[PDB]
């Protein structure tokens, strides 16, 4: 109802970012949606005097045939002044990742009831493109708070506090966190009772996705158990172990390598010795312990690496410094993704990003095992998420792929 003044960081101007091509149906959807939004005063047309531009496209969320408008605010988000509030830099609710169940809700309907600081509005400018440049693209700017901006939930923190005040006091055992346009709600309850409580909460929102963090995995490094070892087996073992020696200090491969001495066929069976078995055992025990001195630094960037294992399976690692992992994991999930690598990759990136948002309260920077052009061409078609993480592209195959399989 009253606009809190917002500016950019010192020295930085408003985002000017090229609008990328859009399909005909997406353009139509955006046209209809924005035509509806203009009547409601949410956005207003602008003239040539506003050089700033931000990318925009359209998607379809889960279990819905209705197109949704998605703005890519990344450049604006980083150019937006770092938002510190009277919240005093709220510490992430670490009790969230420890919860039995967590439900993700979309609160983005609320941001449109709050007007935006006038001088800042020119920075929210976007363009609906036309096919084949036959007509100039339709340009709008946001009068209210746009979804996807990092300043919107920051400004709406107080209102959201006043709205969610009764629910939190009624049942204090329910954890609540807010990121962007999405609201995460944790509970230890039963799935049915969970869903009913969710209905209670959303109807509580009205008058003013199911995750399981406890079922989430932190993967250790495992070695094979065999009655019979071949030369190839032992060579692979020594490889993985020598790799793990970077992570774990006390790993020693010498007595295992001692078995390989001479030139033997890869398929030839090599029986282990007492020294060898002992060494392998000690290595196992070393691997069963966690990593020495692994910590999370909020002043550092999170990095997510993803490897494609094939057969619809993907592995991943979230970390800050090399060979120190904050998390590792695996995604085998198959829904309609069987014949498409890029769709799988996209859903994987979404899952990993969501988990990252739950644990550290911020998205990581992905290193994707895909060519820039392929990804950039196809990623928006499979993308159901309202937030967009940063990413880069690794074009050299890692040797570390089968070491996580």
> Could you list the residues that contact another protein (CB under 8 A)?
21-24, 27, 47-51, 53, 131-136, 139, 230-232, 235, 238-239, 242, 253-254, 257-268, 308, 310, 340-345, 368-371, 373-375, 377-378, 395-397, 399, 401
The least distance separating another protein from the CB of residue 180, rounded to whole angstroms, comes to: 26
State the pairing for strand pair 365-368/390-393. parallel
Per DSSP, the residues of 244-289 read: HHHHSTT---HHHHTTS-S---TT-B----HHHHHHHHHHHHHHTS
Closer residue to another protein in complex, CB, 105/394: 394
Q: What's the CA gap between 361 and 252, in Å, rounded?
A: 38
On whether the CB atoms of residues 177 and 167 are closer than 8 A, the answer is: no
Closer residue to another protein in complex, CB, 157/245: 245
Element containing residue 352 per DSSP (H, E): helix 341-360
Closer residue to another protein in complex, CB, 53/363: 53
The least distance separating another protein from the CB of residue 370, rounded to whole angstroms, comes to: 4
Closer residue to another protein in complex, CB, 77/230: 230
Closer residue to another protein in complex, CB, 157/232: 232
Per DSSP, the residues of 357-390 read: HHHHSS--EEEESS-HHHHHHHGGGS---SS--E
Q: Is 252 exposed, middle or buried (0-12, 13-18, 19+ CB in 10 A)?
A: middle
Closer residue to another protein in complex, CB, 230/384: 230
For the beta carbon of residue 124, count every other beta carbon within 10 angstroms: 25
Closer residue to another protein in complex, CB, 167/375: 375
Closer residue to another protein in complex, CB, 128/326: 128
Q: Which residue has the tokens 């392929």?
A: 374
On whether the CB atoms of residues 367 and 344 are closer than 8 A, the answer is: no
Angle (nearest 5°) at CA 220 between 327 and 292: 70
For the beta carbon of residue 167, count every other beta carbon within 10 angstroms: 17
Q: Is 63 annotated as a binding residue?
A: no
**CB-based contacts of 71: which residues, under 8 Å, 6+ apart?**
54, 55, 56, 126, 146, 147, 148
Of the candidates 59, 54, 55, 53, the one whose C-alpha atom is nearest the C-alpha of residue 25 is 59
Q: Is 13 annotated as a binding residue?
A: no
The least distance separating another protein from the CB of residue 93, rounded to whole angstroms, comes to: 34
Closer residue to another protein in complex, CB, 242/328: 242
Provide the Cα torsion 117, 119, 124, 128; round to 10°: 120
Adjacent-strand bridge partners of 390: 365
Q: Is 182 annotated as a binding residue?
A: yes
Exposure string (b/e) for 23-53, b if CB count within 10 Å is 16 or more?
A: eeebbebbeebbeebeeeebbeebeeeeebb
**CB-based contacts of 184: which residues, under 8 Å, 6+ apart?**
96, 102, 103, 104, 105, 176, 177, 178, 357, 358
Annotated binding site for Mg(2+): 106, 181-182
Annotated binding site: 106, 181-182
């Amino acid at each position: 109802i009253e606009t809190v003044p917002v500016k950019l960081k010192p020295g930085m101007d408003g985002p000017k970012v090229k609008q990328w091509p859009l399909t005909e149906e997406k353009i139509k959807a955006l046209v209809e949606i924005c035509t509806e939004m203009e009547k409601e005063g949410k956005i207003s047309k602008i003239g040539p005097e506003n050089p700033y531009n931000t990318p925009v496209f359209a998607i379809k969320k889960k279990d819905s045939t209705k197109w949704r408008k998605l703005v890519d605010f990344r450049e604006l988000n980083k150019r937006t002044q770092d938002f510190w509030e009277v919240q005093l830099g709220i510490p992430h609710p670490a009790g969230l990742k420890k919860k039995k169940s967590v439900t993700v809700l979309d609160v983005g309907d609320a941001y449109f009831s709050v007007p935006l600081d006038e001088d800042f509005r020119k920075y929210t400018a976007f363009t609906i493109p036309s096919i084949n440049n036959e007509t100039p693209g339709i340009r709008y700017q946001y009068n209210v708070l746009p979804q996807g901006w990092k300043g919107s939930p920051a400004i709406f923190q107080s209102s959201m506090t006043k709205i969610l005040e009764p629910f939190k006091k009624q049942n204090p055992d329910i954890v609540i966190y807010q990121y962007m346009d999405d609201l995460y709600v944790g509970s230890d309850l039963e799935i049915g009772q969970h869903r009913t409580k969710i209905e209670e909460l959303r109807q509580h929102l009205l008058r003013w996705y199911e995750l399981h963090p406890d079922k989430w995995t932190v993967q250790p490094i495992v070695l094979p158990e065999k009655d019979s070892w071949t030369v190839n087996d032992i060579q692979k073992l020594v490889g993985k172990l020598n790799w793990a020696s970077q992570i774990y200090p006390g790993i020693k491969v010498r007595q295992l390598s001692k078995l390989l001495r001479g030139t033997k066929a890869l398929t030839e069976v090599i029986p282990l010795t007492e020294e060898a078995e002992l060494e392998l055992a000690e290595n196992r025990e070393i691997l069963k312990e966690p990593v020495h001195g692994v910590y999370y630094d909020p002043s550092k960037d999170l990095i997510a690496e993803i490897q494609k294992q094939g057969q619809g399976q993907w592995t991943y690692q979230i970390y800050q410094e090399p060979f120190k992992n904050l998390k590792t994991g695996k995604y085998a999930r198959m829904r309609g993704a069987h014949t498409n690598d890029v769709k799988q990759l996209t859903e994987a990136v979404q899952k990993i990003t969501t988990e990252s948002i739950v644990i550290w309260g911020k998205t990581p920077k992905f290193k994707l095992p895909i060519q820039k052009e392929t990804w950039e061409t196809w990623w928006t078609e499979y993308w159901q998420a309202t937030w967009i993480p940063e990413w880069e592209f690794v074009n050299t195959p890692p040797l570390v792929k089968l070491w996580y399989q």
